[PDB]
Design a binder for this molecule. Structure first.
Ligand SMILES: *[C@@H]1O[C@H](CO)[C@@H](O[C@@H]2O[C@H](CO)[C@@H](O[C@@H]3O[C@H](CO[C@H]4O[C@H](CO)[C@@H](O)[C@H](O)[C@@H]4O)[C@@H](O)[C@H](O[C@H]4O[C@H](CO)[C@@H](O)[C@H](O)[C@@H]4O)[C@@H]3O)[C@H](O)[C@H]2NC(C)=O)[C@H](O)[C@H]1NC(C)=O
Ligand SMILES: *[C@@H]1O[C@H](CO)[C@@H](O[C@@H]2O[C@H](CO)[C@@H](O)[C@H](O)[C@H]2NC(C)=O)[C@H](O)[C@H]1NC(C)=O
Ligand SMILES: *[C@@H]1O[C@H](CO)[C@@H](O[C@@H]2O[C@H](CO)[C@@H](O)[C@H](O)[C@H]2NC(C)=O)[C@H](O)[C@H]1NC(C)=O
Ligand SMILES: *[C@@H]1O[C@H](CO)[C@@H](O)[C@H](O)[C@H]1NC(C)=O
Ligand SMILES: *[C@@H]1O[C@H](CO)[C@@H](O)[C@H](O)[C@H]1NC(C)=O
Ligand SMILES: *[C@@H]1O[C@H](CO)[C@@H](O)[C@H](O)[C@H]1NC(C)=O
Ligand SMILES: *[C@@H]1O[C@H](CO)[C@@H](O)[C@H](O)[C@H]1NC(C)=O
Ligand SMILES: *[C@@H]1O[C@H](CO)[C@@H](O)[C@H](O)[C@H]1NC(C)=O
Ligand SMILES: *[C@@H]1O[C@H](CO)[C@@H](O)[C@H](O)[C@H]1NC(C)=O
Ligand SMILES: *[C@@H]1O[C@H](CO)[C@@H](O)[C@H](O)[C@H]1NC(C)=O
Ligand SMILES: *[C@@H]1O[C@H](CO)[C@@H](O)[C@H](O)[C@H]1NC(C)=O
Ligand SMILES: *[C@@H]1O[C@H](CO)[C@@H](O)[C@H](O)[C@H]1NC(C)=O
Lengths: 123, 460, 123, 123, 52
């Protein structure tokens, strides 16, 4: 499947297709407009890569972070989320809470890296 | 017991380098629906939180006479001045001989009538029109003693381009910002001579509000000093280096004008029209400027008592410039889209012999210094590559309630055993104002990589 | 604390502030200059990232490499180096021997990768 | 060495020169062309790095995958390939089957990541 | 003589040929004889490889 093969499919079945939607992010009168759009696409991909790498999840598609999830954010059972819902309604009802989640991931990565350098220096 | 190479990311080391810079402006200047302020709308909006980090215990060399920010500022102002006149009206058919005469009503000195003829929408028919051109914009071409044939001044050299009647020449502040991987070192020393070491250097993303005013001799709106008057010079030995005086207490300066009629619209082709001076309603009065007397007197006295530091056993003196044309010998600036060229003979008439003369009289603030002058319309700034502008006139009366911040002086040829050398106001290139504004800053490139020998060894 | 927190401090004192000094590497007439500065920032970040990524130290501060340290580069003990000297003059005296060091780490990393290849292929 | 030092040598001897060759991937009328060339160089490098990052071989010069090697692609022995064949005609021979190999590495990486997720969430 | 400067507009001045001081001589070119002869001879003897 090419563009958006599982944009409405099963949540548990949409985790087998993240590669094809991530493989294609880069592939005078109009000598400046396409240049600006192409540089903007490059910085969009680079911002995404740096935001992945800032919490220790670079080069790995599905990465895991040890920070917990509060009950005031979603309060919904996992089984019917992963077997009934889609991605679009999740982005509809979670996107207002994303900044504090990103801050929590950044703080957890900072704590993990500081324990790592403390363990490396103490040994 | 041995050493192994260890790479470090985030090492704080500097390298001197040159690069292109951004543009930053406040968001309040984008609300105007008419394109103006010579295209200062494409800059990224600056953040409302200025970040300034002070460095701990490091010193840094500084040199403002050999800087890359001043040259980039000058080239940016030159190119953006040349870019704003591209879709404007061209004054090609205004090279016709002008049959000029004095007006029948009144005297109306410094203006002439100068009625001409111009083409209509038909290339065959031509119609007569009239205006009121200024005296310095009119050159008497002559082959005999003819006192009626006159022509336009800029039809002899180059250009002939009108300014568009929608832009403004007000000095909106701009900030020059370095890209990622670069920083700006700023020296916060109050006694900074201009070249040498600095011990309170701070890293800065980008500068404060820089006002790109256009001025000669005296300096208009700008940032003040911190503690006292500060004097800058390149060598302070030769007589060819323009010495910059940076003031601390500003002196109020105002400038006025009489009342014109309107902008008379004359058509010189399909769609292309120009606005000239029509009649004059009212009386004829001189366009002058006013400066407070005692503020100028004790400001020049403070400049004297601190300029006597470098010449301890000598007295200083002031007079006018050493001759020349109109554009160099006069303090020239802009207000409301109208250009002013005024002599500063009444401002530089004095001397200091080493004795302070106080002025303790609160009831003698009535006395002021007046500067009488004329107004040009055809503009030849930048001393070349300027693309000469025809500034359209302004209908109502205008006022230039402003602030003065600096002086541009130049020494004369000192004779042998002289103790009364004089200082004169200076013109010169436009780089000196921005060099007097960009004294604090130096662009620099950070290198976040390094190597060091450690006791750590990687696992085999 | 952003750019240059301890730019004139002790060599050993600059180790604990590396996590806050290298955080902001990416965070008409006046449109071309903006484009050139944008592209130059992209060049600087990508060059820095790949040059840190050749010798196996991608996404890791204080990386240790098994190449031996030759005595012809500094010939002075590490005690006063790590508690006496700042970064700037050390960079001034090390700048004549950077390409040989970069080649040595590149060769050591590639030999390490070939050794790991032979070790995993031995099973 | 320099630009493609082992460009024609033995297959085995060309595996210890990856560092000194991959390092040079980023290092008016005549102003548009230079900027366009610089941008397209960034495009090619980012495409190559992203394609390495899809199948879990990011930051590694030599990486191993668990996909089986079909004999119909080459039908050749290992010893004379690694001691007698230059990279050029090898890439000429395998050029008819590169997309199948790329898809197989992509599918194997996604399947391996899902098995790792199942094993890690089992605990 | 010089560039005779003729002005045909506001700043658009061209330069034409002015006078001529002296006699009138023809602008010529010179090539050494034996060098050109043996160069063309070498061209012939090497071009004879493709034509027997
Ligand atoms: C150094 O610093 C001084 C101090 O700011 C600057 O002086 C200012 O100059 C600007 C011009 O660039 C002046 O702005 C003009 O003010 C005129 C009078 O304003 C009064 O009247 C209007 C109603 O007509 C009121 O709204 C206002 O509050 C005042 O009560 C206006 O008539 C001008 O309008 C022009 O511009 C607009 C916008 O483009 C056009 O639509 C109009 O048609 C017209 O062309 C203009 O707004 C400002 O007043 C000055 N300040 C002071 C305190 O007087 C210097 O310019 C600056 N630089 C130098 C080199 O000296
Ligand atoms: C400049 O000269 C023109 C004529 O060449 C003057 O225009 C005349 O003004 C009188 C006003 O009494 C009219 O009666 C005429 O019809 C006008 N003649 C025209 C328009 O061709 C003009 O007034 C003069 N300028 C000034 C300032 O007086
Ligand atoms: C056309 O412009 C030239 C400048 O390139 C004028 O030449 C000088 O102009 C000044 C200003 O009036 C005079 O003082 C000089 O005497 C002029 N000559 C020289 C040799 O410097 C020239 O006069 C202009 N044309 C006319 C007719 O005025
Ligand atoms: C001066 O530099 C030293 C470097 O060892 C530093 O420890 C000290 O704090 C600095 N002094 C001040 C006042 O910052
Ligand atoms: C200007 O042009 C008109 C054309 O209508 C002509 O009659 C006149 O003689 C010209 N000259 C002057 C000085 O008006
Ligand atoms: C250095 O400049 C800063 C600017 O905020 C100032 O606060 C500080 O006092 C200065 N340092 C000294 C030693 O004066
Ligand atoms: C300019 O400065 C240099 C060094 O500061 C000095 O040698 C030279 O004499 C100065 N120039 C003049 C004209 O005095
Ligand atoms: C200024 O320069 C002129 C030029 O000769 C000179 O005569 C005069 O004495 C100087 N000083 C004053 C105050 O005018
Ligand atoms: C300025 O004022 C002086 C003194 O009255 C006068 O001599 C001079 O002609 C005036 N104009 C200029 C352009 O200097
Ligand atoms: C300067 O001031 C003196 C005394 O105040 C006065 O006599 C003189 O006219 C003024 N102007 C000049 C150009 O000397
Ligand atoms: C000149 O314009 C100003 C606008 O600030 C106005 O206050 C003043 O009255 C005007 N002058 C006259 C003589 O009306
Ligand atoms: C000039 O001085 C006056 C009086 O001190 C002040 O109100 C004004 O803001 C100053 N101008 C600028 C541009 O700061």
């Amino acid at each position: 499947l090419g563009f958006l093969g599982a944009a409405g499919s099963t949540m548990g079945a949409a985790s087998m297709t993240l590669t094809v939607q991530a493989r294609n992010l880069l592939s005078t009168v109009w000598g400046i407009k396409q240049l600006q759009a192409r540089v903007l696409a490059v910085e969009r991909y680079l911002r995404d890569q740096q935001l992945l790498g800032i919490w220790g999840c670079s080069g790995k598609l599905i990465c895991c972070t040890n920070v917990p999830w509060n009950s005031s954010w979603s309060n919904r059972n996992l089984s019917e989320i992963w077997d009934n819902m889609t991605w679009l309604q999740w982005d509809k009802e979670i996107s207002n809470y994303t900044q504090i989640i990103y801050g929590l991931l950044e703080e957890s990565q900072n704590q993990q890296e500081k324990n790592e350098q403390d363990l490396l220096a103490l040994d | 017991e041995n050493l192994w190479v260890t790479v470090y990311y985030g090492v704080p080391v500097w390298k001197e380098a040159k690069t292109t810079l951004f543009c930053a402006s406040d968001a309040r200047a984008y609300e105007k629906e008419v394109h103006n302020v010579w295209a200062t709308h494409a800059c990224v909006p600056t953040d409302p939180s200025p970040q300034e980090l002070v460095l701990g215990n490091v010193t840094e060399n500084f040199n403002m006479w050999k800087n890359d920010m001043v040259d980039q500022m000058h080239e940016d102002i030159i190119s953006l001045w040349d870019q704003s006149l591209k879709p404007c009206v061209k004054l090609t058919p205004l090279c016709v001989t002008l049959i000029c005469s004095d007006a029948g009503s009144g005297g109306v000195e410094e203006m002439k009538n100068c009625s001409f003829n111009t083409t209509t929408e038909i290339r065959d028919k031509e119609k007569k029109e009239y205006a009121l051109f200024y005296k310095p914009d009119i050159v008497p071409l002559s082959e005999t003693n003819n006192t009626s044939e006159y022509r336009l001044i800029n039809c002899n050299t180059s250009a002939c381009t009108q300014a568009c009647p929608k832009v403004t020449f007000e000095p909106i502040p701009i900030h020059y910002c370095a890209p990622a991987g670069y920083a700006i070192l700023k020296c916060n020393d109050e006694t900074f001579n201009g070249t040498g070491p600095c011990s309170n250097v701070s890293t800065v993303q980008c500068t404060h509000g820089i006002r790109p005013v256009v001025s000669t001799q005296l300096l208009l709106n700008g940032s003040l000093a911190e503690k006292e008057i500060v004097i800058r010079s390149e060598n302070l030995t030769n007589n060819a280096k323009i010495i910059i005086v940076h003031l601390h207490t500003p002196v109020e300066i105002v400038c006025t004008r009489p009342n014109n009629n309107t902008r008379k619209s004359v058509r010189i082709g399909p769609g292309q029209t120009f606005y000239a001076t029509g009649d004059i309603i009212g009386d004829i009065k001189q366009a002058h400027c006013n400066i407070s007397e005692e503020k100028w007197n004790d400001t020049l006295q403070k400049v004297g008592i601190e300029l006597q530091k470098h010449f301890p056993n000598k007295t200083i003196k002031y007079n006018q410039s050493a001759g020349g044309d109109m554009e160099i010998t006069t303090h020239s600036f802009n207000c409301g889209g109208e250009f002013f060229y005024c002599n500063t003979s009444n401002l530089f008439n004095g001397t200091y012999n080493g004795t302070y003369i106080s002025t303790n009289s609160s009831a003698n603030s009535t006395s002021t210094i007046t500067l009488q002058c004329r107004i040009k319309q055809i503009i030849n700034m930048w001393q070349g590559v300027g693309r000469c502008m025809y500034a359209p006139p302004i209908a109502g009366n205008i006022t230039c309630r402003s602030n003065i911040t600096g002086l541009l002086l130049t020494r004369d040829g000192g004779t042998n055993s002289n103790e009364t050398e004089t200082f004169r106001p200076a013109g010169g290139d436009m780089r000196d104002n921005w060099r007097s504004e960009l004294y604090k800053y130096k662009v620099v490139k950070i290198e976040p990589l390094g190597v060091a020998p450690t006791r750590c060894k990687r696992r085999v």
